[PDB]
Amino acid sequence: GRYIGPVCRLCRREGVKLYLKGERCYSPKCAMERRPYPPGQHGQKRARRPSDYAVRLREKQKLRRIYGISERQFRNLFEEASKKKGVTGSVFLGLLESRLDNVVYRLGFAVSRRQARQLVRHGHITVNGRRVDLPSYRVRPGDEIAVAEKSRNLELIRQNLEAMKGRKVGPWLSLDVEGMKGKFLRLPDREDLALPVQENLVIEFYSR
Amino acid sequence: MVKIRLARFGSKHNPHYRIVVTDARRKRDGKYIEKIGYYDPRKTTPDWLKVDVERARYWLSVGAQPTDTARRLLRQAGVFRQE
Amino acid sequence: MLTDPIADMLTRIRNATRVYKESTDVPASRFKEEILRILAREGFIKGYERVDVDGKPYLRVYLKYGPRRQGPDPRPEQVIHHIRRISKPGRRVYVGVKEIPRVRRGLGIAILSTSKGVLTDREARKLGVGGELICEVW
Amino acid sequence: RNLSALKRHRQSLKRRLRNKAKKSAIKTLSKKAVQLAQEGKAEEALKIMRKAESLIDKAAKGSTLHKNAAARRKSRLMRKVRQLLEAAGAPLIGGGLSA
């Protein structure tokens, strides 16, 4: 199963600030705010010039840990993106961004991607009516992604979609805070996303 | 004796047959002579039975001999309706 | 004797241009003259002309180069950077219109010999024909 | 044990003894006819030839010879007899042969 384990440490190792949590990774806490250096005993000693490998390695690690997906799945997706027409880099990002868990996270139904995963898993999320509980489900353009009628009363879902009143949403999405509905308009492009990722490096990492 | 019958092509618990013309002696899933239709027993989709009666009418005209089920489907497809 | 006259001519040209000759003779042959016409048209040579030497027919091939350069070795850039025989005796090479290679992404050319006559990969691709892949120039 | 389609072997033996006999008659008479044509004996040779033809066509009636086999027999028989008779310098005295 997916990672599990201290998260605001991957942030530290990856250097960049990954938002593997909600509210907190905004508070003046998310370690990168306190000790923005890798975990462990030698976290503070000088860093040696990374090898081309290290570079490509880390970049992938980063992009991947953001969507908290395994290496297996992450890899398969990549190979698919690689096989389709059109710039692999963008395409790959598009597919990762089409995961149900991600879209639920994108619509604000969940505070973090992890939380989004659990929402989907416990059938609190619905896709065009029928409920889906596969965090890996691929949302296509046109799909309406709502909260479970039954679940619409869950304190958490209330609290969340409440804070959503006001907040905007990705130009490839549309949220109806009203009926707790959301709609997948189109595949986000690389320009739409603002990930601290150098997709060129990830593509290269798999070249080797 | 050449026949018009059903060949298993679905998958475990997901049967899908190909209405087919083949010599009676072939395996049921072996080399047939010609496919002339298909059939989804569970109607998982609107189009769960196509038949191409033109061809059926031909094989029948040459001694093809339908299975009792193959015929049921061929019939349903209007293969025998003379009107 | 000359085992392969076409290869011969391509080499005379290759050798002459490496020392920057202006002209250069190659024993006359219709086929040779055919190839040469493409070389000219394609702007690889200034042109050529039938000439007589020792009473025998040759082909003055007027070579051409780029302009003088800077720093050390101000030697001109070549117009004919590369010129190599492909189809050769004891090892012939034929391609179908759909197997005609694209030399240096089109910056270069190839010279087939089809039953529609000697053509460049493009001329050939156009008339939709293949043939003996004579040489590659670029 | 005992697979009752032991009946099959039972039957086979009887069928064998049945064909076995018909084919002997055929051979015998054929020779007989041939031998006579050889002798030059016109009438009798031909006469016998007819029985031969008959038994042959009859063997092909059931599954002891059938079609071609029988056809092959008849041709080779009428073949030899004709030739042997002509060679013997004998005039075909009625019966058989579309002379």
Place this chain on the structure above:
Amino acid sequence: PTINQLVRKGREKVRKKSKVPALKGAPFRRGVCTVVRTVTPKKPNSALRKVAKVRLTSGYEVTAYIPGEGHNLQEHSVVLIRGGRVKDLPGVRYHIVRGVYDAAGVKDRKKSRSKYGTKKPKEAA
């Protein structure tokens, strides 16, 4: 070669030679210890490597290394061979597998135990 020669004689395909005749192109092979010696390294090394003569089911009597800090192999031990040279001891081309048959797994091993076949310590207890 000229193209004509290539047509007459052609190229010769490279043949691969095994470095582990454990016959049946097998992954492992069992046998019985015959001698359970001690062997000294070569060139620049010094130590008393633990080796063992093994009579294989494959009909081969070969020498195998016994990895680990200590073992329990006697004259008729019986064990599984897995192949793996031992740079320092020419002639030694297979390792004995600890944790299989009469070859006890290393005692006290706490790290790379998958190898050395020592079960996980019951700290979880």
Place this chain on the structure above:
Amino acid sequence: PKKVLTGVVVSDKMQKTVTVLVERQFPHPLYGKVIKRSKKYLAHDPEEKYKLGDVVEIIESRPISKRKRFRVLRLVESGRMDLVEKYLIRRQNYQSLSKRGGKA
């Protein structure tokens, strides 16, 4: 289509049969260079109508004998041992490169 072949009669040493040496060219599957290659067919000659040196056409036929599956269809050009010559010499070299040796 019953296969039709063209070769040279390199042998009329038999009764109603002639050996026709059919030749064929083609690119080498890997080296590409065109390579010649040949074969001898024993064509049927009922009328002993063909002589050593003829360039005949062979036609695929119903078996005539073991080894005979072609019939001489028609003569293409009479006499020309220049071809037969080759064949025979190639043969002559054989009895040589065995225990001792051949010629030049």
Place this chain on the structure above:
RNA sequence: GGCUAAUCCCCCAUGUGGACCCGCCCCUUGGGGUGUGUCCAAAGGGCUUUGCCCGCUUCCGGAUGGGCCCGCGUCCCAUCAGCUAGUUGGUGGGGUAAUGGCCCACCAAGGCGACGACGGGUAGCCGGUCUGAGAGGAUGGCCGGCCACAGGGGCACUGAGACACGGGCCCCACUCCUACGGGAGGCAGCAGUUAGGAAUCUUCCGCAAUGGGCGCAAGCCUGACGGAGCGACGCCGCUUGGAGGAAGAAGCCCUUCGGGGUGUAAACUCCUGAACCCGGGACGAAACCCCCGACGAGGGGACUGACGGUACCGGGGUAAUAGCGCCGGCCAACUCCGUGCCAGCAGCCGCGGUAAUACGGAGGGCGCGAGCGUUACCCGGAUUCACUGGGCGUAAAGGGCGUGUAGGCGGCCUGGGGCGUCCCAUGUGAAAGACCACGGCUCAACCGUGGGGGAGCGUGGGAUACGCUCAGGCUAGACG
């Protein structure tokens, strides 16, 4: 030894027709027609019984399946170079459904080979599969097609078809029965046992569905099949939680004793709620059959599920498995202690003889995760057998030199052919798999439908620059 039925077998007749000999015609290997001669048919059963069903006979045609023949393709060794006497061809005959030395008698003296005969080794072949940028290399397991086999060897019988896995005969080996005379067996069918091995499952359920054999039908048979069982063996999907939570607990580790790390990690609060309980409960199954109608078309009716009470749906509901490899360079991940060329590590270089990021442990860390790592084998990196794509003065590699056979290669101009080569159209290239799209299972794996491409080969038509070939001419090569 005796009796007896039939759709069992035989005789006569009828000859639509068909077979054979001979003749003639058209066709062209034995195709089709035609004349005389001869020759050859059949069986009955059921009834809603003067009609309808099931079946029978001869013949032509179709459809399906198949035999045989041919071109091209199909591994290693030339430390295998000569092989052959039914051997090569012929004439007549035998045999077969049929060609054929397939077999036989006579005749001729041929046939094959370095384009590798003969011999040895290895091996079922293919669609495909794995790898690779490709060319290529490796492979033929699941599934589909073909071949071959059924303890080993040989043989035929019966049949439309067999030289017949669960038919027959003989010989051989082994096993079992025997009163010793003589008998009985063959799991390379399903499951299972045992032996060998590093290693490969249930003596399961059902005939409901699909398919098959027999039957007018009802129906019977079906270890084929549809299912279930066992094994992380593979692939796909999923869980071991989610949010908050200290400039930061304890324990453990490091320290320049100031402090640093494990770590928001935990504790802890709130939230959801796999498991598990309760309720409902399936698609797969509509035909055969019956009735109306003509036993047709069509319309109506009835019977039937192993999987399964499973999937799925609804209610309730517990914070609820984590491991394995690695951290000297290649290569992502470093410190303390122990040890002292020891014990050990090791894919390669190499590391260990008192300051070891390389040995063992610990703390920390990197990688992947119900997996992780090892061993084995294939392709890759390897342009390291080089066609794409290599080389040989000194690195491995020019033959000691020549003469010359086969073979490979071939100057300039014209013409014919159009074999190579190029072009167009057409046939073939099954299905599966591969590529794309849409679709079914909550996704995916898996599967349905559709689309696209496809080397090679067959046929028809066309082009002629180059290679070829034939014919003619030339003098620059060559020779005199």
